[PDB]
Curated annotation (Swiss-Prot), chains A, B:
This is Nickel and cobalt resistance protein CnrR. One of its GO terms (cellular component) is periplasmic space. The lineage of its organism: Bacteria, Pseudomonadati, Pseudomonadota, Betaproteobacteria, Burkholderiales. Residues 17-80 form a coiled coil. The keyword Coiled coil applies. It comes from Cupriavidus metallidurans (strain ATCC 43123 / DSM 2839 / NBRC 102507 / CH34). Its main location: periplasm. Keywords: Cobalt, Coiled coil, Nickel, Periplasm, Plasmid, Signal.
């Protein structure tokens, strides 16, 4: 229920200096994201394929849901790590607005 | 990326007889759903609380993400079981449209 990383960058955007300070970590996260999203799409495709061929529960369905679950969990965890990277690159006085947005979105299920 | 159960009921709604045949299983799923959504909200709240008090990675963050991941996986699995219950309660000649919607939505990541 919400793209946490995009919510943060939109609601409390980095200032000019912070954008420079975080450039490398933003690049590395964008790549990590992508990689995990690739795993996630493949897992969804495997689930869809299993069910298209055999429209019933089977061990392939159980396994594909486990694979989806873990890839989604991995993306949530990698995104949180990068959310803390961003917080580290903020001016300290900007952290309270950041925390307001972060906590509120987490409570709503944003990842 | 999509409420699979709602997508099915909207795109290929049950006919009058099928609605009657599936009434019990729809009631039981609505309840199971709710229960799992309760777990999910609590897990999100725990994650938000951990991070509101300690804005950094900790074992409480790791654990809360594991709890979210498993509750989301459980909801996906329970929803699939109920999706197969619905398919069982359809007239056989309605299953091809149902499968079209189901497979297409799964491929897109709907749960
Ligand atoms: Co960022
Ligand atoms: Co239903």
């Amino acid at each position: 229920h919400g793209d946490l990383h995009e919510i943060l960058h939109e609601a409390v955007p980095l200032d000019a200096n912070e954008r420079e300070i975080l450039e490398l970590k933003e690049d590395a996260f964008a790549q990590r994201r992508r990689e995990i999203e690739t795993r996630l799409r493949a897992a969804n495709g495997k689930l869809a394929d299993a069910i298209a061929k055999n429209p019933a529960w089977s061990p392939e369905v159980e396994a594909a849901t486990q694979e989806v679950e873990r890839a989604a969990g991995d993306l949530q965890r990698a995104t949180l790590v990068h959310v803390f990277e961003m917080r580290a690159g903020l001016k300290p006085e900007h952290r309270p607005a950041y925390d307001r947005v972060l906590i509120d979105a987490l409570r709503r299920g944003s990842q």
